[PDB]
């Protein structure tokens, strides 16, 4: 299917570009991080010289912040010389790849409040409409909120 053929190639391109680097960092973090932090802290994104780490809780973020310089130094020694800064965020059960899959084809932010323009056109039609339709058009135009200036 066309949808399926368009999928894998895009995923592979992302891995070639930067997901592989994230995976390598995640592998390195397992060696760098101490005992109970290895499974609770992961690399989420890499952009230019900035690395974004995610901690399961704010308390864990503090522990990561304590060793942040150690992590950055070791990543550079292992070939990530481009990394110069680390941002630590708190992420609970929120699924990284699943969020990407769910909101991939353009940000879906629906903003449907009615415009004063629509109310004006509804009233313009109401002038030519029969009494029954005129009342419904005026009712819809009354429902149209704007109040600009």
């Amino acid at each position: 299917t066309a949808t399926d053929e368009l999928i894998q190639a895009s995923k592979l391109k992302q891995i070639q570009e930067h997901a592989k680097a994230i995976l390598l960092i995640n592998r390195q973090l397992q060696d760098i991080l101490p005992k109970g932090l290895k499974t609770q802290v992961r690399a989420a994104n890499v952009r230019g010289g900035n690395l974004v780490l995610e901690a399961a809780s704010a308390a864990l973020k503090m522990k990561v912040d304590y060793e942040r310089l150690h992590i950055l130094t070791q990543l550079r020694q292992n070939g990530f010389g481009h990394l110069i800064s680390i941002e630590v965020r708190v992420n609970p059960e929120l699924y990284r790849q699943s969020k990407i899959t769910s909101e991939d084809a353009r940000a879906a932010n629906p903003r449907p409040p009615l415009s004063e323009h629509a109310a004006h056109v509804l009233l313009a039609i109401a002038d030519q409409a029969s009494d029954k339709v005129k009342k419904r058009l005026q009712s819809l135009a009354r429902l149209a909120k704007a109040n600009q200036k």
Partner: protein
């Protein structure tokens, strides 16, 4: 029952001197074959409506069966039966977003 409905609609068309368009579903057996375009035999299995129809038109979309078809957005209208004209096929632009066929 379907044969009587088809006969009654043809009688209605003659009575009022008006074209009567009736929509029909193709038989499920066609999906088992899925190798060629729809034919009159696909409708005969559902009430022998062919005998009463003056014009039979089939709708075929290659993109539905083959998403990688080069005919994406094109629907083929197949003339399966015609009393006052030729049989053949017409390609139309199918715009699903607008629920419209264009020439």
């Amino acid at each position: 029952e379907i044969a009587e409905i088809s006969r009654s609609l043809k009688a209605l068309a003659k009575e009022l001197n008006v074209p009567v368009v009736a929509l029909s579903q193709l038989n499920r057996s066609l999906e088992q074959r899925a190798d060629k375009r729809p034919v009159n035999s696909d409708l005969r299995e559902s009430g022998s409506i062919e005998q009463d129809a003056d014009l039979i038109m089939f709708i075929y979309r290659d993109e539905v069966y083959h998403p990688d078809s080069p005919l994406k957005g094109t629907a083929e209208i197949i003339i399966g039966k015609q009393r006052n004209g030729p049989i053949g096929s017409v390609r139309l632009t199918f715009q699903g977003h607008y629920s419209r066929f264009d020439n």
